[PDB]
Design a protein around this ligand. Structure first.
Ligand SMILES: [Cl-]
Ligand SMILES: [Cl-]
Length: 162
């Protein structure tokens, strides 16, 4: 298991524009297009992202290309963030994947607001971080996904994904 397989499980794959769990136009493996209610706005963002006239549909290779870019961007957003980087550097390889998963889902700014959780993660107080991570809109809106990510931070194993 690795970050790509983990996110592929959590995000799924859909080849036509769809609305994510928040109601936002998305495509592929959780690639958010726009927060705008306008499907034409989404289609225009999609053509822009892919470099051709898609009319709302992309191929599997194209979905995986955006996915690679988004995983890369999530990692790079962690490393450029003064609040995220030192926590990430302190973690083992499996828990680092949980950190990337969170940034991928909610963005650099969102995660960086888990101030108390981040501190507990840096101190390796795993059970306490897990409890604090769960007291969040994140956990209440997407409990099954959030539990899997939290279990990964708690245990440092891939058990929630096997
Ligand atoms: Cl893009
Ligand atoms: Cl969920």
């Amino acid at each position: 298991m690795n970050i790509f397989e983990m996110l592929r499980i959590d995000e799924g794959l859909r080849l036509k524009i769809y609305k994510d769990t928040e109601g936002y136009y998305t495509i592929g493996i959780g690639h958010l297009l726009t927060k705008s209610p306008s499907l034409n706005a989404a289609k225009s963002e999609l053509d822009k992202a892919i470099g051709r006239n898609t009319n709302g549909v992309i191929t599997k290779d194209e979905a995986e290309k955006l996915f690679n870019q988004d995983v890369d961007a999530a990692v790079r957003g962690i490393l450029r963030n003064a609040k995220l980087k030192p926590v990430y550097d302190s973690l083992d390889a499996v828990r680092r994947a949980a950190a990337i998963n969170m940034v991928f889902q909610m963005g650099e700014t969102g995660v960086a607001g888990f101030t108390n959780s981040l501190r507990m993660l840096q101190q390796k107080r795993w059970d306490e971080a897990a409890v604090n991570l769960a007291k969040s809109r994140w956990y209440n809106q997407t409990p099954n996904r959030a539990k899997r990510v939290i279990t990964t931070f708690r245990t440092g194993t891939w058990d929630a994904y096997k």
